Amino acid sequence: IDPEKAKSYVAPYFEKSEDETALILKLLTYNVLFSFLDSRDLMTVAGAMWRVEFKQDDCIMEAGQTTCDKLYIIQDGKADIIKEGQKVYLKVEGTAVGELELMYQTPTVATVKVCTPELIAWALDRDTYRHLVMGSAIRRRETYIQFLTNIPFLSGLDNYEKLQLADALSSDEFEPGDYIIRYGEEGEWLYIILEGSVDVVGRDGNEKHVWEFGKGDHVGELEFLNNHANVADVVAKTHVVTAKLNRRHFEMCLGPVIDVLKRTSQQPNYEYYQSKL
Ligand SMILES: O=c1[nH]cnc2c1ncn2[C@@H]1O[C@H](CO)[C@@H](O)[C@H]1O
Ligand SMILES: O=c1[nH]cnc2c1ncn2[C@@H]1O[C@H](CO)[C@@H](O)[C@H]1O
């Protein structure tokens, strides 16, 4: 995609009710594919979507076809991902199907079979997806996936899921002394430390040193798990490079390792954190 061609691309518009547009935007907001669009782009994308109904056992797309030039975001229902006759993944409400073929321009990798009495989805055509949504997804996936296969708490994600997490990550560089996370404030970001060291500075206020973390560790999830303001600062001790994830996408991206994060917070290195609770 030429950037100028993406700039001047006029998306189709398919009239729909205010209620349907609102429901679409809620789906686009939590789905990883759209994490970098601003409001006007989200509105345009929603205008280019149209509603599709499937009944149980329908194949939305079939492995090996080349004719499917669309993305589907699931509103209601579930679908099986079937490779070589085996169910290998389950797509639930709010997730998308078809993105791999739109990104990479290959034939349909897997068969997607509705396994609920009905499935209601919203479809998006190849050109709108490529011009308005894709952006630099392919570069983000290729960049981050080298680091993500070495992050301990992400072992519980399969390969497809690690790549999908890359869709919603964004990098930041910090300098010795920079506050990455600041006590008392609202948690919105989960940070993965790709390089450097950081200090967890708690309180009791009393400014008390809690723990030191480094390459491969994560910070910020405690506020996601338990919905409370930051119980501690996180301060760059060296130059730190991070990839971060917005709370929006916490469940969609890390669902399969949310249980590991719970265990981790019940370790002794969270004595400070246990006692505050
Ligand atoms: O390994 C997978 N894990 C999870 N979902 C997959 C996988 N492979 C494919 N899809 C889903 O099936 C669609 C059609 O091939 C893809 O676009 C993707 O949404
Ligand atoms: O007791 C602790 N031990 C280790 N890390 C902690 C502890 N408490 C908080 N954090 C880290 O600091 C962030 C801000 O609250 C938490 O989300 C977590 O990443």
Author numbering: 211 to 414, 417 to 489
Quote the study on this structure.
Cyclic nucleotide binding domains (CNB) confer allosteric regulation by cAMP or cGMP to many signaling proteins, including PKA and PKG. PKA of phylogenetically distant Trypanosoma is the first exception as it is cyclic nucleotide-independent and responsive to nucleoside analogues. Here, we show that natural nucleosides inosine, guanosine and adenosine are nanomolar affinity CNB ligands and activators of PKA orthologs of the important tropical pathogens Trypanosoma brucei, Trypanosoma cruzi, and Leishmania. Substitution of two to three amino acids in the binding sites is sufficient for conversion of CNB domains from nucleoside to cyclic nucleotide specificity.
